[PDB]
Amino acid sequence: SYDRAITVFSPDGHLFQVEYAQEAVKKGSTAVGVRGRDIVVLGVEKKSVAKLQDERTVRKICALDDNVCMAFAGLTADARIVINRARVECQSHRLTVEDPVTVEYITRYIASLKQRYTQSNGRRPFGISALIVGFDFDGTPRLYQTDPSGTYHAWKANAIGRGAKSVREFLEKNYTDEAIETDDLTIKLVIKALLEVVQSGGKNIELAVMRRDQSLKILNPEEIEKYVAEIEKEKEE
């Protein structure tokens, strides 16, 4: 079996394979999360359109368990491996603790998987970041982010993928008690955040929500463009 050291230090303390994995994330489709008051929302860009594509087969938002889902940006094949490992683990946890995973537990698990692939022979790092959302047993809503290095943090709102810098800038200005007072405004805050960067807006922003105890709901293109008009005609005033 192949034992080559793949991720190694360079002069000045860099881990080039990890940095390059981060470059792969930056060329992925934009993905955004906001933590509401009693809802959490994920939206993600595009990716290409293409009328001949079966939409269902290429979603970038994924259930891990009933109370936890995730979006990713970066190498879609890499993600699929991370997603399935996390799904297996949610069932191991439920087996041996008889509670659903906390969002932090599975986040911590994904992150340390990622970290392991930056420090094990024969492997390159995973080329993805993830936004992980759900609710804890006590109803507290959660939004976590992981990156190829295996670092993770909780966020009020965040973006990853191409144009994350400007989308994060927008969220810093627009994330207030007022923008998340209700469910519709939380959802719209995500759509505004994307609509900034999303090329032929929009059209192609896949979106999903999660409510306390309520499990994952994805919005259809009819239900999305309702919110698009309901924000577009508001920005004329």
Partner: protein
């Protein structure tokens, strides 16, 4: 030994995987291969490269493989690599069948193989498989289906698609002629011949140079058939008659 290891499973500075991309160049040169979904079935149509006069003709096809009762695939790229993969698809499909006593759903088969291709891009230090595949099938969850996979270990579902030589051109023609929700096996067959006619521009199309397989349902049972040469000539004839009509 560090000196001789070409390091097939590492990132380049822009987050790229060169061997995957290079394998994608191999595929682009291989025989054109297209898939088309209809309401009453799914088809594969492929350019034959085994075309020298002295070849023997011994199997029922060159690039169409049966995977299990309800599915078939075609391939573009390195043939020997494609034999390893199609053998592994058949094994995966029987393992499921053994375990659950129902046929593997189409997407599940595709995903299982793609995870093997993915692994070869992330660890092991080997070259990836130089193959893209089109999968056709029926299952009881989503009916008629068409999938495409490539050496990155990535896949998607399609209503129509193409891999191999002149892919981009073939997809362009499909974008324009394909009717979402309204295609039949007979119209899809016609569109397939149209597309191969345009994309085999070296030179004049012939039944000995293509392979067509259809997957349909009859009496609650999947039927997978490689069209005989008579039917292929007949369809080419109808396409050539149809072009006579074009102007007046």
């Amino acid at each position: 030994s560090r000196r001789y290891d070409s390091r097939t499973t590492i990132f380049s500075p822009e987050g790229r995987l060169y061997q995957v991309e290079y394998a994608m160049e191999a595929i682009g040169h291989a025989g054109t291969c297209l898939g088309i979904l209809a309401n009453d079935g799914v088809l594969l149509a492929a350019e034959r490269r085994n075309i020298h006069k002295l070849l023997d003709e011994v199997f029922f096809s060159e690039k169409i493989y049966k995977l299990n009762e309800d599915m078939a695939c075609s391939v573009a790229g390195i043939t020997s690599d494609a034999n390893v993969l199609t053998n592994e698809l058949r094994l995966i499909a029987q393992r499921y069948l053994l375990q659950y006593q129902e046929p593997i759903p189409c997407e599940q088969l595709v995903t299982a193989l793609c995870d093997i291709k993915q692994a070869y891009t992330q660890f092991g230090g080997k070259r990836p498989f130089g193959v893209s595949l089109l999968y056709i099938g029926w299952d009881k969850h989503y009916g008629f289906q068409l999938y495409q996979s490539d050496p990155s270990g990535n896949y998607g579902g399609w209503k129509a698609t193409c891999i191999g030589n002149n892919s981009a051109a073939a997809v362009s023609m499909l974008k324009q002629d394909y009717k979402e929700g309204e295609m039949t096996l007979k119209s899809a067959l016609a569109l397939a011949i149209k597309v191969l006619n345009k994309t085999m521009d070296v030179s004049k199309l012939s039944a000995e140079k293509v392979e067509i397989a259809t997957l349909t349902r009859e009496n609650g049972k999947t039927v997978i058939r490689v069209l005989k040469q008579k039917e292929v000539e007949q369809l080419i004839k109808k396409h050539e008659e149809e072009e006579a009509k074009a102007e007046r």
